[PDB]
Structures are given as C-alpha cells and as structure tokens.
Amino acid sequence: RMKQIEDKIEEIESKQKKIENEIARIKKLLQLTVWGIKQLRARIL
Amino acid sequence: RMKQIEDKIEEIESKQKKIENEIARIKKLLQLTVWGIKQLRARIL
Amino acid sequence: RMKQIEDKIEEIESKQKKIENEIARIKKLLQLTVWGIKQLRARIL
Ligand SMILES: [Cl-]
Ligand SMILES: [Cl-]
C-alpha cells in the first residue's frame, strides 16, 4: 500500500512539473503580447 | 492514517485537474489575443 | 516512512498553492491585454 501511495505521489509530482513548465511558457508569450500592444499603440498613436 | 493520506492525495489530484483545465482556457484566450494583435497590425499597418 | 510521505505531500501542496497564485496573476494580465486590444481597435478603427 505504501508503494501505491508513493507511485501516485510520483505521478502528481511529474504532472506538477509539466504544469510549471507550461506556466513559464504562457508567461513568456503573455510578455510578447504586451510588447506587441505597446509597440502598436506607440508606433500608431 | 493511510486513509488520511489517501484523502489528501485525492484533494491534490482534484485541484491539479482544475488547474490543468484553467491552463487550457488561458492558452486558448492567449491564442485569441495573438490573433487580435496580428489582425490589428495587418489591417492597419 | 509515513512522515516522509507526509512531508512530500506538504511540499506538493505548497507548490500547488504557488501555482494557483501564479495562474490568478496570469489571468489578470491577460484581461488587461484584452482590454488594450479592445481599446486600440475601438479608438483607431
Ligand atoms: Cl500541480
Ligand atoms: Cl495576450
């Protein structure tokens, strides 16, 4: 039963790592969209 | 004590599923904002 | 061994809380970028 719990924890940890990786990618893209809106407003208006 | 650990794991798993769902929604909206910035720049500039 | 499992669960929970916090911040910034694209399109076009 302990091994079953340990395996489930490993699975949750692995997925948490994937989620953290996704979040960093989202943050980077979000920063690029901020840049684009800022560049648009400045270059046009 | 094992049941207490198993219940906590279930709670963490449930919340992880909610987080994954939120992340997909964020990604989709982020893709729409990219589209909007791209469409703006192309249609105007 | 139970304490080791309980400590790992605490670590995963702590990181899950940080992730939830990050997600809320991403959502708020994403809402601001939506506002900016909407304001741009309306003010210009
Ligand atoms: Cl997670
Ligand atoms: Cl965006």
Numbering used by the authors:
A (entry chain A), B (entry chain A), C (entry chain A): 1 to 45
Question: What does the publication say?
Answer:
PIE12-trimer is a highly potent d-peptide HIV-1 entry inhibitor that broadly targets group M isolates. It specifically binds the three identical conserved hydrophobic pockets at the base of the gp41 N-trimer with sub-femtomolar affinity. The target of PIE12 is the highly conserved pocket at the base of the gp41 N-trimer, a parallel trimeric coiled-coil region of gp41 that is transiently exposed (“prehairpin intermediate”) during HIV-1 entry. PIE12-trimer prevents the folding of the N-trimer and C-peptide regions of gp41 into the 6-helix bundle (trimer-of-hairpins) structure required for membrane fusion during viral entry, and it inhibits all members of a diverse panel of primary Group M HIV isolate strains with high pM to low nM potency (IC50).
Eventually, HIV developed resistance to PIE12-trimer by mutating Q577 in the gp41 pocket. Expanding on our earlier work that selected for viral resistance to PIE12-trimer, here we describe the biochemical, structural, and functional properties of the primary PIE12-trimer resistance mutations (Q577R/N/K). As in all previous d-peptide/IQN17 structures, IQN17 forms a continuous trimeric coiled coil with the d-peptide binding to the gp41 hydrophobic pocket region. In the WT structure, Q577 hydrogen bonds with d-Glu9 and d-Trp12 in PIE12. Q577R disrupts these hydrogen bonds, likely accounting for the loss of affinity, and induces a repositioning of two adjacent residues (d-Glu9 in PIE12 and L581 in IQN17, although d-Glu9 position is variable in the WT structures). Q577R disrupts two hydrogen bonds between PIE12-trimer and the inhibitor-binding pocket and substantially decreases binding affinity. The Q577R mutation results in a dramatic (~ 65-fold) weakening of the interaction between PIE12-monomer and the hydrophobic pocket (Q577R KD = 2.0 µM vs. 0.031 µM for WT), corresponding to a 2.5 kcal/mol weakening of the PIE12 interaction. Because our inhibitor is trimeric, we expect the impact on PIE12-trimer’s binding energy to be three times as great, corresponding to a geometric drop of binding affinity of 653 (or > 250,000). This large decrease in binding affinity is consistent with the prediction that an extremely disruptive mutation is required to overcome PIE12-trimer’s highly charged resistance capacitor. In an HXB2 pseudovirion, Q577R confers > 4000-fold resistance to PIE12-trimer. Q577 mutation confers a significant fitness defect as seen by delayed viral replication.
